[PDB]
Amino acid sequence: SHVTLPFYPKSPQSKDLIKEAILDNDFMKNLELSQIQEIVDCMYPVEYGKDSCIIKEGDVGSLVYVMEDGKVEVTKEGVKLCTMGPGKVFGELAILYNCTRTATVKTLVNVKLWAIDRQCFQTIMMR
Amino acid sequence: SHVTLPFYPKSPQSKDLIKEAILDNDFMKNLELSQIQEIVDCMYPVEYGKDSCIIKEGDVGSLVYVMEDGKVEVTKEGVKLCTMGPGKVFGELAILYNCTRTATVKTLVNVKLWAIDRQCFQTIMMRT
Ligand SMILES: Nc1ncnc2c1ncn2[C@@H]1O[C@@H]2COP(=O)(O)O[C@H]2[C@H]1O
């Protein structure tokens, strides 16, 4: 009758980094534990090498990311806004407020991320 | 019980200029009209004389501004980035990224602004 969310096995310390990264993000410090637990179980791993463009400002959004290793640079209109380290969320705006990517994310080093797709996250709001 | 956002009574003209500034921001046009209203109500007035620096690059962010009157010039690392007048929103970037101000805003003539602070600004974005 109702949808089933994909489940991705994780190390307990991965699980811990994701959660805490979520609590750290301004626009998600309002989520119920139950809901954060559902997010944590739903992210999947993705790696990018250095000099990689993950998010292009203007394109549409479908993935929200938590960074486990590495360091990324954020730019809007060729302007360096800031850099981001592990334990930080990003690419959340276009998923929450259904807009287009507000800036571009390039990698500086190799990075390992967690990512959750459009569909899954929506469902986790219906709580 | 949740928190209670402050109310700032406003001239209809102003309540409308602000709605304009917001709808013209290249990110905030995507907000629900309710959220836009809640914002409008939470803005409050600030005045600056000319040759004054409102936002300094590298600083911690706290306030988003809308501009009612005046001209301001946005810069960075010494370089100019654009003139700017009434109806525009600025200072959204540092809030949208829990990072630091990315530019330096200075007046050019006497200016008048509306300002929402970041706690209000985010409390509003957590809806519906
Ligand atoms: N290249 C640019 N063109 C126009 N406005 C800008 C530019 N860069 C920054 N700003 C504005 O200037 C503000 C300076 O502080 P913020 O980064 O918080 O938000 C910024 C934007 O509102």
Residue numbers in the entry:
A (entry chain D): 92 to 218
B (entry chain A): 92 to 219
Sentences copied from the publication:
The cGMP-dependent protein kinases (PKG) belong to the family of serine/threonine kinases and are one of the major intracellular receptors for cGMP. Next, two cyclic-nucleotide binding domains (CNBD-A and CNBD-B) are followed by the catalytic domain. Binding of cGMP to the CNBDs is thought to induce a conformational change that activates the kinase by removing the autoinhibitory domain from the catalytic cleft, leaving the catalytic domain free to phosphorylate downstream substrates. To understand the overall architecture of the cGMP-binding domain and the molecular features required for cGMP binding, we determined crystal structures of the CNBD-A of human PKG I bound to cGMP, cAMP or in the absence of bound nucleotide.
